[PDB]
Design a protein around this ligand. Structure first.
Ligand SMILES: [Fe+3]
Ligand SMILES: [Fe+3]
Lengths: 168, 168
């Protein structure tokens, strides 16, 4: 299916406060889609940003396995503890205000946990002709972004998701 | 329904080059949605832009009845001649690359003639759960933007529409 929900029973409000606090120490990079890597390659020199990527040439996710160490004392660490799968290349993926990206097919589905969002942030599946909202309800949403799609944020606030990759 | 198409048999390439030459003598204003008024109130002193003002400044479209004189001997004036209705407050309305607007209900539904567009430009109707594309095929698309909707342009180029009002 396009999307499925899995209850993590995470507190959206404590999760937000934890993310907002982390970005004050480790700010998002890029524009349009702003990013922070939450997993890094073993023994990485640039653990907070190496995993961040948006150029046309996508590289493999398999090496970004280490949840950063300073997360285990934060509520954001609790999200990783509750995951029912082993995540790879986890990133904060924040859509800027009034921003959307190209209609395209992604390489791989991802799980999205919306941290901050609004009714103006949607996924748009072109062939399925469905519009999908991911609420900041503390639960995990599988989104099949291999389907022809775009995402937009028509609001004036950043739409912040945590986006988890998986092998299996 | 959300949309309807009336055959106009405008030539897309001629309309496009007509619009490009107009715009380099009368530039678009604003960011995000960039605009130019093609109709003005009688005796308007700022006829190319008064019709572009935001809603809180405009009681209704009905006063903007006059097609600019310099349009009559161009291909654009031919477009006005072929419409099956009396147009009011017609504007060029260009959506910026990678831009979208909030999910809202528009005051007034309008007729769209796409000038330049791409597969990355769509209307999104939230309640109807439908995604619409308006092709640059020389025909006129009524779009009921009173419905809860957004629009987005995920391409690298501006999505240029001519947007016609009507009083019926
Ligand atoms: Fe824990
Ligand atoms: Fe649908």
């Amino acid at each position: 299916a396009l999307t499925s929900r899995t209850e993590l029973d995470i507190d959206p409000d404590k999760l937000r406060e934890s993310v907002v606090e982390l970005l004050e120490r480790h700010p998002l990079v890029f524009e349009g889609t702003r990013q922070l890597a939450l997993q890094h390659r073993p023994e990485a020199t640039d653990p907070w940003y190496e995993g961040c990527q948006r150029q046309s040439l996508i590289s493999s996710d398999s090496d970004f396995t280490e949840v950063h160490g300073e997360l285990r004392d934060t509520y954001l660490g609790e999200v990783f503890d509750r995951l029912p799968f082993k995540p790879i290349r986890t990133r904060i993926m924040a859509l800027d205000p009034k921003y959307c990206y190209s209609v395209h097919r992604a390489l791989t589905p991802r799980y999205h946990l919306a941290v901050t969002t609004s009714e103006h942030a949607r996924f748009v599946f072109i062939e399925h002709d469905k519009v999908l909202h991911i609420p900041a309800d503390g639960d995990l949403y599988y989104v099949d972004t291999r389907q022809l799609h775009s995402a937009f944020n028509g609001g004036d606030d950043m739409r912040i998701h945590i986006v988890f990759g998986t092998d299996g």
